[PDB]
């Protein structure tokens, strides 16, 4: 059972971006700049944001992390977002989630200018994604897709089970993998089952045993065990649980054809696909 | 034997409800609602459907007009008409009947309808909001599919649903509505939903439908669904309309012997589409969203 290294794949992707950025700068353009807004003291968020600005510097993208206390109000966050939207030096702008409960996450995401929305969370980017149009794709779902494509695991006509339906992770993953290879933004042409918190465990297993690709994005440890997987299927662990994913790694290790580890799997791919999006935003292709 | 769900009967009831809501709106002293339909070319199915929409408008007390244009119209001329209608305060709802000719970009057309008048739910903002489970103008055929299920009392939470078809105006919204959270702004069905399409091998489709409590076929393939694919007691909703006579995607007579529920073609989802459009038009006229 091949253990796919997300670290190695994201290394290639980041090298590609570093090349694309250097060539872009060589032709006289402004160096790309990414602004990350971070709210409060969530230790995972700080770690994740640090991994994003480390990767940016490595690929020639300038960055600033702007840290605010959790006691910030919604109006003050909106003010900051608006100043950044109007700062021509800023090409990409993202607000790290989760935000405190007194702040409306959807209003914040919709406040980032769409051309700077390297998260792909603005409702117009969500809509364009769901219509298979050119869009800024969200980093974690695009990272899952890249994991699958660059490992050469086929999707067209194959059975895919996604565990989870969150709008930032599980749902874009299901959208990418079932949609038409031939559309503006190609999809994976797979047969996709969406399961979630109301799928009975027994019904989950009855679909996973049929799956050539099981993608777990629920945030429950050991949700995916070896009896649910069929021999040779690919299992992609998006979950992050305090650290393990959603898959029983050691057991499923012995039945799957491929598997991603946690850490070092999807995580570093999320950071890598954000670099792609940032150079895309700098070029104003979309 | 399977209960046959009359979509025409359900739709007629829904139109009575819309008629009452429109009369109350007018009696309260608001302008009577007006729906404009733009029809391009001479697709006979399109002319049929638009005639059914304008009839239903008259039944429910909504003023209407179909504006017919030759297929040789240019995209810019269609956008000029759309802009004119966007700016007419007498028009509450505006829709452009699909499909359009090849030289007209359907997405740009749909995005040019002012979102408050977008009774189709095809504007990208309505699509985005729907995919986020936010309040939105829901597209008529998927909403009609949802209402057949809800008004017949067929359960969805925790159940297995297979949708055959992934088109952006029909199959994708049906899949979105049925799998999403019951507790969100726009509630969903909380079902476990398999999305199949033109590259799903016939043997793999069957392997999923046989587990399904609800099978929703919107492919446009006669006899795509047959009795061996359906588990006994399951609900089967036939969105397809295929000229062969008009048939659905379902082997009606065969699946009728195994399903718990089934919708006919014609007289099933079709009239439900027209009824849910009338609902969206009074919604648009009220500026609720
Ligand atoms: N780069 C990465 O590796 C990366 C990036 C982002 C998020 N994640 C992780 O992905 C996971 C989920 O993402 P989120 O934060 O958007 O999740 P969330 O907390 O919003 O919800 C997770 C989803 O799992 C579903 N679910 C719950 N119980 C289930 C069950 N028994 N069977 C099937 N589905 C079930 C829920 O309905 C929900 O849709 C988390 O672990 C999150 O940290 C990983
Ligand atoms: N009110 C109504 O009943 C209503 C309204 C609109 C359209 N329709 C009908 O619904 C059908 C489809 O409409 P559309 O606009 O989505 O059509 P479309 O041609 O845009 O889409 C066809 C869809 O079917 C899928 N498909 C094709 N072969 C398949 C197969 N073997 N298995 C599974 N999926 C397969 C395709 O991949 C695609 O997703 C047609 O019969 C159309 O006339 C009905
Ligand atoms: N706005 C916004 N908010 C968000 N919360 C996200 N998700 C968002 O950052 N996910 C994420 C998860 C893990 C890692 C990561 O670096 N994972 C490493 C190690 C992390 C750790 O040490 O815990 C790994 O899994 O190998 C990076 C990003 C996002 O993409 N955008
Ligand atoms: N803009 C736009 N274009 C579109 N093409 C649609 N779909 C869109 O009109 N579907 C539809 C299908 C069938 C009927 C209908 O009246 N069906 C009847 C009989 C139809 C017939 O005479 O053939 C039935 O199914 O029983 C009405 C609408 C839409 O909703 N919006």
Author numbering:
A (entry chain B): 37 to 278, 289 to 332
B (entry chain A): 36 to 279, 288 to 332
Which sentences from the paper describe this structure?
Methylenetetrahydrofolate dehydrogenase/cyclohydrolase 2 (MTHFD2) is a bifunctional metabolic enzyme found in mitochondria, exhibiting both dehydrogenase and cyclohydrolase catalytic activities. In one-carbon metabolism, MTHFD2 converts 5, 10-methylene tetrahydrofolate (5,10-CH2-THF) to 10-formyl tetrahydrofolate (10-CHO-THF) in mitochondria, thereby regulating the production of NADH, purines, and pyrimidines. An isozyme, methylenetetrahydrofolate dehydrogenase, cyclohydrolase and formyltetrahydrofolate synthetase 1 (MTHFD1), performs similar catalytic reactions to MTHFD2, albeit localized in the cytoplasm rather than the mitochondrion. The key distinction between these two proteins lie in their expression profiles: MTHFD1 is typically expressed in normal cells while MTHFD2 is abundantly expressed in immortal, embryonic, and cancer cells, but absent in adult normal cells.
